[PDB]
Tab-separated table of C-alpha atoms and ligand atoms in Angstrom:
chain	number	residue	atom	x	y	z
L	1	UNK	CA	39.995	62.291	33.513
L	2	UNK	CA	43.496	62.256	35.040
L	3	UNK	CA	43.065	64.837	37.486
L	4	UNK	CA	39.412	64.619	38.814
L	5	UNK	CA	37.465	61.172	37.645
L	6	UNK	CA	33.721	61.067	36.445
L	7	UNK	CA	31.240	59.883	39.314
L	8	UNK	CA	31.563	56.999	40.905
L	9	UNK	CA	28.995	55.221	43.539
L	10	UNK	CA	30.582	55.476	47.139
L	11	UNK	CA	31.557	51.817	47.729
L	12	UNK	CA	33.579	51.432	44.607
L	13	UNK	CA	36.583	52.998	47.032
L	14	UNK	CA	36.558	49.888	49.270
L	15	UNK	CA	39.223	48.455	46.807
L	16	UNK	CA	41.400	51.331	47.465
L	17	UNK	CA	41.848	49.491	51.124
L	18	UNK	CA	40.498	45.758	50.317
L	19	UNK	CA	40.356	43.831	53.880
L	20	UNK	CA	41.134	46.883	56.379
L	21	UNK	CA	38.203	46.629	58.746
L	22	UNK	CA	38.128	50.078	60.006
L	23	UNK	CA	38.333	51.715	56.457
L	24	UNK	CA	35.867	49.407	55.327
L	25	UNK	CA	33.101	50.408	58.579
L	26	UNK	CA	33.558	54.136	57.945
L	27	UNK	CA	33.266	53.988	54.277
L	28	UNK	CA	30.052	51.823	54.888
L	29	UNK	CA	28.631	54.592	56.975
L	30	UNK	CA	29.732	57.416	54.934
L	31	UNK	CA	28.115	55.670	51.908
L	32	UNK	CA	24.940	55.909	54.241
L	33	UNK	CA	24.639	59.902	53.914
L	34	UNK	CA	26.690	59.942	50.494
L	35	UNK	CA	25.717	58.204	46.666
L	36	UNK	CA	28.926	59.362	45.036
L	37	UNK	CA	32.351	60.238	44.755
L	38	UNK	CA	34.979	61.873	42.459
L	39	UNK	CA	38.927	61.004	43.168
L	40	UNK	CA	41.457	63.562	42.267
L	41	UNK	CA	45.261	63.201	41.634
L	42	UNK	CA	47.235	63.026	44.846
L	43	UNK	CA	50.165	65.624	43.440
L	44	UNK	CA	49.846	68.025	46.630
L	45	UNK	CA	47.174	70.529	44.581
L	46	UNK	CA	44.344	68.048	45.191
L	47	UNK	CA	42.587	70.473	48.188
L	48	UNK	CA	42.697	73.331	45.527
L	49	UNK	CA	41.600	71.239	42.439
L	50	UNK	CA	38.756	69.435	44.408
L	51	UNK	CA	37.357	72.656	46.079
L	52	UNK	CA	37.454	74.658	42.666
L	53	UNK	CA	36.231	72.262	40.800
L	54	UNK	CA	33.544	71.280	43.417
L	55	UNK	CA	31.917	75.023	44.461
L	56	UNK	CA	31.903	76.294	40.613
L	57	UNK	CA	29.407	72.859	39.715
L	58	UNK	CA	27.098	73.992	42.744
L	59	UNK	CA	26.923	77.088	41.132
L	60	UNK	CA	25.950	75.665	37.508
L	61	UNK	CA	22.479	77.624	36.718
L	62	UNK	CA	21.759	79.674	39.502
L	63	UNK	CA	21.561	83.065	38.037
L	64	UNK	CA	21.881	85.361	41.049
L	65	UNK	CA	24.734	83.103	42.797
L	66	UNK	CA	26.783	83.347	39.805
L	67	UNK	CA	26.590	87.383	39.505
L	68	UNK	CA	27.661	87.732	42.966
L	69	UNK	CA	30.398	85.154	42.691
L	70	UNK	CA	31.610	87.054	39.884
L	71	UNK	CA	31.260	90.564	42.183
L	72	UNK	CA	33.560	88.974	44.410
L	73	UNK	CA	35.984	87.661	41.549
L	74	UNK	CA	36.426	90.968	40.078
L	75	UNK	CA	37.518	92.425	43.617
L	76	UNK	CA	40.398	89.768	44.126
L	77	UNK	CA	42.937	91.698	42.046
L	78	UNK	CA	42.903	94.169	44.990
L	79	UNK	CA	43.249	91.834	47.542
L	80	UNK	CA	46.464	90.419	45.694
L	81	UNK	CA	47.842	93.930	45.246
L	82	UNK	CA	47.485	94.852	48.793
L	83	UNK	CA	49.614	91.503	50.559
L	84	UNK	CA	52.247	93.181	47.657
L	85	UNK	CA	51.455	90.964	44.604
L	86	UNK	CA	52.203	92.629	41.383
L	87	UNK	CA	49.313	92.998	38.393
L	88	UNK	CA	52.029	91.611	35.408
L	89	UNK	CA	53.023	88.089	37.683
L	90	UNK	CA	49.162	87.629	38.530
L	91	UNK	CA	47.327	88.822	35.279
L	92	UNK	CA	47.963	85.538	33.740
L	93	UNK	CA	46.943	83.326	37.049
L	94	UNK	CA	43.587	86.041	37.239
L	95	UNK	CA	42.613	85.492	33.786
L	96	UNK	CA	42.627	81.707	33.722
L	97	UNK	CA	40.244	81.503	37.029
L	98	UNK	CA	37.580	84.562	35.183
L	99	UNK	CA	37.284	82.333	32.097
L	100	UNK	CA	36.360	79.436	33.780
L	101	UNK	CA	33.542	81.511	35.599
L	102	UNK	CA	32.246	82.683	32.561
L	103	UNK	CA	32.266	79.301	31.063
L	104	UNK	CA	29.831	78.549	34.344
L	105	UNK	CA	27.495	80.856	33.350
L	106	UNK	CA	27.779	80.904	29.287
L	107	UNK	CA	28.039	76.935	28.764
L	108	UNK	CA	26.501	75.815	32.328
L	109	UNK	CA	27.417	72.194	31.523
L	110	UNK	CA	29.365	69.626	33.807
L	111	UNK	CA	31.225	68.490	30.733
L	112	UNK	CA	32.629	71.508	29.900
L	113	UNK	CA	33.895	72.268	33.793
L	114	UNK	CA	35.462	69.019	33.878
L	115	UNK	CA	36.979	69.422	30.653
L	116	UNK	CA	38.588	72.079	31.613
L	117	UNK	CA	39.682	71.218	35.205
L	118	UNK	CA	41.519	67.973	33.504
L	119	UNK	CA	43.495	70.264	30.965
L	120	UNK	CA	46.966	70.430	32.948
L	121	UNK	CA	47.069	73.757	31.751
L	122	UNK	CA	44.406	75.572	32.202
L	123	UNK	CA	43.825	73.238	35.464
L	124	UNK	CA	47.509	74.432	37.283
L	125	UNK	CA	46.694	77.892	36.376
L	126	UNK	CA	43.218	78.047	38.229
L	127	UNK	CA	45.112	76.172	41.576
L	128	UNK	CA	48.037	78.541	40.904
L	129	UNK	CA	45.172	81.473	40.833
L	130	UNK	CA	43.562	80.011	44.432
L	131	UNK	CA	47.487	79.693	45.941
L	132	UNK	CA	47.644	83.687	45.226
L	133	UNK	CA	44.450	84.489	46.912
L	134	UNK	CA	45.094	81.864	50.068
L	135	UNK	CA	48.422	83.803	50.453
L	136	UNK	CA	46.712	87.399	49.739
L	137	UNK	CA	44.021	86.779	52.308
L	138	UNK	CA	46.018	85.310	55.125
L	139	UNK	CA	49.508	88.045	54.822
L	140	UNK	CA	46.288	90.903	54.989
L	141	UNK	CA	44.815	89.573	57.957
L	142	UNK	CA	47.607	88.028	59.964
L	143	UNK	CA	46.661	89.379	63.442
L	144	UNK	CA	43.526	87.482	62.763
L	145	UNK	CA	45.118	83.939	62.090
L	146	UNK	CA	48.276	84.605	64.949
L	147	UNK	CA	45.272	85.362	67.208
L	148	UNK	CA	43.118	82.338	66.574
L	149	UNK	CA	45.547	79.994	65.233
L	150	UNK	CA	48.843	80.100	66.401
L	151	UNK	CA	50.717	82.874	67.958
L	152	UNK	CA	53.815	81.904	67.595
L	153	UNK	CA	53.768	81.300	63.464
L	154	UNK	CA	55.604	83.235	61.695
L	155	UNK	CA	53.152	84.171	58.660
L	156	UNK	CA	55.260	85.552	55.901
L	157	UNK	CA	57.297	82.758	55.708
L	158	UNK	CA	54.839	79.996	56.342
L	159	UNK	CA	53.053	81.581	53.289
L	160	UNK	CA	56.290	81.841	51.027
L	161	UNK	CA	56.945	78.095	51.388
L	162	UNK	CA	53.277	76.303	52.498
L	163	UNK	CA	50.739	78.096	50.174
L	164	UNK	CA	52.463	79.828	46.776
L	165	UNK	CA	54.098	76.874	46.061
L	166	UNK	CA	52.559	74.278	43.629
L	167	UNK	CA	52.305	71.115	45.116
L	168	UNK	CA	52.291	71.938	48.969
L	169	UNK	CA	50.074	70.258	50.885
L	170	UNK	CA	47.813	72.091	53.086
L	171	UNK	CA	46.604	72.027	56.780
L	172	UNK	CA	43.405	73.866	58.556
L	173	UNK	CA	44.796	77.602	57.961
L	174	UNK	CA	44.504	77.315	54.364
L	175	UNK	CA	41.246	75.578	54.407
L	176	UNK	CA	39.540	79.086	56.548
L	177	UNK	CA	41.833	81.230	54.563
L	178	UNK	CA	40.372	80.140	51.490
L	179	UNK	CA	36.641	79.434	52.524
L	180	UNK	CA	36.756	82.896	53.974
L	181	UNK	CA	38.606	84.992	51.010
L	182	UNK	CA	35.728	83.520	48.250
L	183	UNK	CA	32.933	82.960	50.504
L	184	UNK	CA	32.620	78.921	50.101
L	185	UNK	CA	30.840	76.896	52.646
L	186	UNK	CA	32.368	73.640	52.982
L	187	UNK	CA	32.438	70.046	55.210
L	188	UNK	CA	35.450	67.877	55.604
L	189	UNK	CA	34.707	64.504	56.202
L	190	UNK	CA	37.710	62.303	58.705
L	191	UNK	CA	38.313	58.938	57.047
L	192	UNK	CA	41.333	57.700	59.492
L	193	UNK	CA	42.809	54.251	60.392
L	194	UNK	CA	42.362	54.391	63.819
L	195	UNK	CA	39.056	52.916	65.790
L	196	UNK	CA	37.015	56.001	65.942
L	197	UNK	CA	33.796	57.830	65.010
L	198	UNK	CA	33.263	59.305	61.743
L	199	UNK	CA	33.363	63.040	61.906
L	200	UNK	CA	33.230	66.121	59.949
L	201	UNK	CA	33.904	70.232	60.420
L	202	UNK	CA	32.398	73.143	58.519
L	203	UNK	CA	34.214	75.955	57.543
L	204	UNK	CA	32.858	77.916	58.696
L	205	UNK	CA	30.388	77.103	61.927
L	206	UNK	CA	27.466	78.001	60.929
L	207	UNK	CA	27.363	77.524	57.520
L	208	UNK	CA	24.891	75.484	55.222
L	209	UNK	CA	27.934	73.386	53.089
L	210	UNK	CA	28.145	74.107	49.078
L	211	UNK	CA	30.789	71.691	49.161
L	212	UNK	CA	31.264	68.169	50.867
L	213	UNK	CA	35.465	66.663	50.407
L	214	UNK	CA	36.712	63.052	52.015
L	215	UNK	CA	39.849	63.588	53.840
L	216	UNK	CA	41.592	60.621	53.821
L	217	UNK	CA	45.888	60.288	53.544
L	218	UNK	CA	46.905	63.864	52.963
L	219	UNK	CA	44.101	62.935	50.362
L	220	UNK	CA	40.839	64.981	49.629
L	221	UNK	CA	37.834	63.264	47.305
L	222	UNK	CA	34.836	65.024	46.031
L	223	UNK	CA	31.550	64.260	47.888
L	224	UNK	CA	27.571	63.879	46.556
L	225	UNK	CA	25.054	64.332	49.232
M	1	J61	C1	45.620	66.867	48.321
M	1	J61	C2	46.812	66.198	47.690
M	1	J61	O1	47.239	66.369	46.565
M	1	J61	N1	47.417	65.280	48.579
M	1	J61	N2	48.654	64.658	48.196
M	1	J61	C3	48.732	63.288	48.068
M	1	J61	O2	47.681	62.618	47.947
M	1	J61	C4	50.117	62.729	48.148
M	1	J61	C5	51.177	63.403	47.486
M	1	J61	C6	52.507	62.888	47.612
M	1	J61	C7	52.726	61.674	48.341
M	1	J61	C8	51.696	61.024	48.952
M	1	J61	C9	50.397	61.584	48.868
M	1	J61	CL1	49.097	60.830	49.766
């Protein structure tokens, strides 16, 4: 359990900052709304690892949300082949993520999904897989994101060297990019240093979360509600 831990109860990461007051007051109140937590390897995959691992568990039994998850999965070639992806440099990538959906819905056991998602292997693949699709999703729709992000990014080259890569570390375009191109509702909780509130944002606004994530030093942990 190297790359996402078993559960935890949510006060057992006060010894990650023993005696800082402010991390100590927010974790308190967090721990109000939250019982658990799982950490995750900082290596600079951790917002693809924790959000993989964390929406295919919420989908562990529920019949009809797994069929149209897989719907959607079966599309994503195309959307790969249309930002100019080629089928032989994918295929392997695409294969690794549709066996661990069909291990959701043939085994439909935690044990298994974690087993998997702390084999390096099969584990790099799957966040290799979700770098593909960030980068397929945002190079397709780029008026969208200079429009309502930043107009003066330039989004070939911010996808090149800030999303394909393994271990680059993401920012708020590839959290929409990817909560958009599978359909995941998610909340970030903000677990800074300095002497504010608590907050959180859903991705998107409306939604009813599938997945909760602590955000705390480049760092994001695996909520329980
Ligand atoms: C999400 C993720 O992997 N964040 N990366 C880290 O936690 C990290 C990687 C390199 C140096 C420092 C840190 Cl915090």
């Amino acid at each position: 359990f190297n790359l996402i831990s078993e559960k935890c109860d949510i006060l057992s990461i006060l010894r990650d900052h023993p005696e800082n007051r402010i991390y100590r007051r927010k974790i308190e109140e967090l721990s109000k709304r939250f019982t658990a937590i799982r950490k995750t390897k900082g290596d600079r995959n951790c917002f693809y690892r924790a959000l993989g691992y964390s929406y295919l568990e919420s989908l562990l039994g529920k019949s009809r949300e797994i069929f149209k998850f897989k719907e959607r999965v079966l599309q994503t070639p195309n959307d790969l082949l249309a930002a100019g992806f080629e089928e032989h440099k994918f295929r392997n990538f695409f294969n690794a993520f549709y066996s661990v959906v069909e291990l959701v819905e043939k085994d439909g056991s935690v044990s298994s999904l974690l087993k998997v998602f702390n084999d390096q292997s099969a584990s790099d693949h799957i966040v290799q897989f979700l770098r593909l699709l960030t980068s397929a999703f945002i190079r397709n729709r780029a008026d969208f994101f200079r429009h309502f992000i930043d107009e003066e990014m330039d989004i070939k080259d911010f996808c090149t060297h800030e999303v394909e890569p393994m271990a680059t570390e993401c920012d708020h375009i590839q959290i929409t990019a990817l909560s958009q191109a599978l359909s995941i509702a998610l909340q970030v909780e903000y677990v800074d240093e300095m002497d504010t509130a608590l907050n959180h944002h859903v991705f998107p606004e409306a939604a009813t979360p599938s997945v909760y994530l602590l955000y705390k030093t480049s760092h994001y942990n695996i909520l329980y509600a």
